[PDB]
Swiss-Prot record, chains A, B:
GO terms for molecular function: gamma-butyrobetaine dioxygenase activity; identical protein binding; iron ion binding; zinc ion binding. It comes from the Eukaryota. PANTHER family: GAMMA-BUTYROBETAINE DIOXYGENASE, GAMMA-BUTYROBETAINE HYDROXYLASE-RELATED. Binds 1 Fe(2+) ion per subunit. Its cofactor is Fe(2+); L-ascorbate. Pfam families: GBBH-like_N (PF06155), TauD (PF02668). This is Gamma-butyrobetaine dioxygenase. It comes from Homo sapiens.
Length: 385, 385
């Protein structure tokens, strides 16, 4: 295209910048040091790995272009030490340092589109076997998981092993002290409040870890009629409402380190401790993760005494908002259903049910790392486009 | 002890605080809301899980103590709604909200002691089989790993499978796209600069992931006489020197997001992207992780053009300090040697060596999560004390 065709290339700014004038009349600028650092020749770049061999030690940070020629599709550069580089037009164009170009590329890499939701949620639903068999369906699955935060898959079996198939479709699951996969059932000497018939209030899984699981997979093998309905809420949507309604409570929860703990025996013996802010913000003040399980929050609370009661007051306000009828979405899982969701963004819970002489309710769960998921999503997108 | 024996317990501050006067005359304060939240009774606390059943929804954040009695070893509290709680003296004492008590407990949980080192490093060394067989030795191993950042284990075999034994001793290894364990050897169509005979400059492993591996294990199966010596540097020590010598360069590297990438096929097919600050600080300005591999730093750099050359100038200053003869420690791995090190703190590298018609050099590596390691360290400490 005219946008990707070179009209003129020139060294500017004491030879420290290259400027490309494109055939659409737009101009791009490329620092000489960045071009040299990204030389694609075999000395500098290992093509089989698509990786940089060039060392920092080799890079003159004050380098300027010694000579430059070009045609419509490439630039050819000589360097002061006689090194020689070639750069393709389309490669340069994609990597333009303009804010618009950089932002476009970041969108393509990280899929930031987010659709916030309340009690009006239309639970995205796909077929399990279709997702396993067809790239178009697996793509819709992971893209929707990223954007909405949850997808339900229907028509799995009523036998263990289904979350493992989804894990292989992603790449691999995320092993924790509760196993490769884990069985949510009422257990004698339960090592986790999950493994009882009690109500689970809204929580994220595993804030006792530094790096809580990014994605959760939960498959219904057996369901009870006595209770055990599912509830979910969009934590990012809730945090937005909290900041607006109660900025003091938002400030406390986004700045206060809370200790989490887990001790017991499952896959192996464990004694786990972490610290997190319940509302975890990026450097720009945007919420990126919620870290909260009331069951594993430690008895240890490392704050001065005067900060304690205001913390709990803040926390109450947050949970009250999560529970509001405008925020929460309630549903019942049947055998064969699987939900896959963003464990950093949603909070989830379940209603109490009745104990029995044999197991009346059984879910099999597993976790996946967001990096594993995003990798597969990038591959799938390329395959489908 | 007199320190742990109750002399007086009293509700204060409108019944919103409990004060304990101990037999040493020291005073501790406990917020009423915190005591109620941490009731150990069977309604509030699941003993088999050592976890809180009590919901946020159940907690009156404005609660005060209705009645209190005590003896030397426990306090007995009635609440306004008629709930009833018992707290043991030793439990309360450990959880005193004084800064001194809180800081002591944080030390016991997280083992913060750090011993910075330069080229004078005396490489801590233990026997491999001793570490597998004896808790006293496994304790010294992990405690030293945490404090110094590296331990060498000698007397392993010259066969694959040794890092896997150490992984089981910790709990489990950290699976990545390069496998459960991985073979560092020269490979045709290498998917990583590591799998060549080239020099690796100082790097941390895997900044292409959001959560880079906490701990690295590297076992020498075959070594070459033609090169391939090992080099290490204490990144936390280096960052301290950089902040002192060049505060501008420190500021740039601790505030600038750098994109990292990895594309290829190994355990499965992958297309990985991340963003990190190379020098990653906590909320108090202390360095907690270094994220840097020059080979996987992307060609994509998401900064305005005017910030590019100063970034590279900063980076050069950092690498130059890492390479200084006062900072780096160089050694040669022989068959049977294993190093286990903090991949968030150290940077590591290796000298070039000569290609041959069969494999002349072979290391087997693996990763572990710091949470897995710290769990085992806590268990071991308890077993040994
Ligand atoms: C379901 N399992 C694996 C027990 N995790 C619950 C969540 C947690 O303990 O934070
Ligand atoms: C040794 N392996 C597993 C290839 N990793 C190298 C480090 C990296 O690619 O950042
Ligand atoms: O049992 C359910 O429906 C939900 N389970 C969980 O959220 C859990 O085990 O952490
Ligand atoms: O080969 C060596 O001695 C060191 N290897 C690495 O650091 C690597 O593979 O990332
Ligand atoms: Ni859960
Ligand atoms: Ni390495
Ligand atoms: Zn080159
Ligand atoms: Zn109670």
């Amino acid at each position: 295209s005219m946008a990707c065709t070179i009209q003129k290339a020139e060294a500017l700014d004491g030879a420290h910048l290259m400027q490309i004038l494109w055939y659409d009349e737009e101009e791009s600028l490329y620092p000489a040091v960045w071009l040299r650092d990204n030389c694609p020749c075999s000395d500098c770049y290992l093509d089989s790995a698509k990786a940089r061999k060039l060392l920092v030690e080799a890079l003159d940070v004050n380098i300027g272009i010694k000579g430059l020629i070009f045609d419509r599709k490439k630039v050819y550069i000589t360097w002061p030490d006689e090194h020689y580089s070639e750069f393709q037009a389309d490669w340069l164009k994609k990597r333009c340092f303009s804010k618009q170009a950089r932002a476009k590329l970041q969108r393509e890499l990280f899929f930031p589109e987010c659709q916030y939701w309340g009690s009006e949620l239309q639970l995205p639903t796909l077929d399990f076997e279709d997702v396993l068999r067809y790239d178009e369906h697996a793509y819709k699955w992971l893209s929707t998981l990223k954007k909405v935060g949850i997808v339900r898959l229907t028509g799995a079996s009523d036998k263990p092993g289904e979350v493992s198939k989804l894990g292989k479709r992603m790449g691999f699951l995320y092993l924790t002290f509760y196993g490769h996969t884990w069985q949510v059932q009422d257990k004698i000497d339960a090592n986790n409040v999950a493994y009882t018939t009690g109500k689970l209030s809204f929580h994220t899984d595993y804030p006792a870890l530094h790096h809580p699981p990014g994605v959760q997979l939960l498959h219904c093998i057996k369901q009870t009629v006595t209770g055990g309905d599912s509830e979910i809420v969009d934590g990012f949507n809730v945090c937005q409402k909290l900041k607006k309604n109660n900025p003091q409570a938002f400030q406390i929860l986004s700045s206060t380190f809370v200790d989490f703990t887990d001790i017991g025996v499952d896959y192996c013996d464990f004694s786990v401790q972490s610290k997190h802010k319940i509302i975890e913000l990026d450097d720009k003040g945007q919420v990126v993760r919620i870290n909260f399980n009331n069951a594993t929050r430690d008895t240890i609370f490392d704050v001065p005494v005067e900060r304690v009661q205001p913390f709990y007051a803040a926390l109450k306000e947050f949970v009250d908002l999560m529970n509001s009828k405008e925020s929460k979405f309630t549903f019942k899982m049947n055998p064969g259903d699987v939900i896959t969701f963003d464990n950093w963004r949603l909070l989830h819970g379940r209603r109490s049910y009745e104990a029995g002489t044999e197991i009346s309710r059984h879910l099999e769960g597993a976790y996946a790392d967001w990096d594993v998921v995003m990798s597969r999503l990038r591959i799938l997108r390329q395959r489908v486009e």
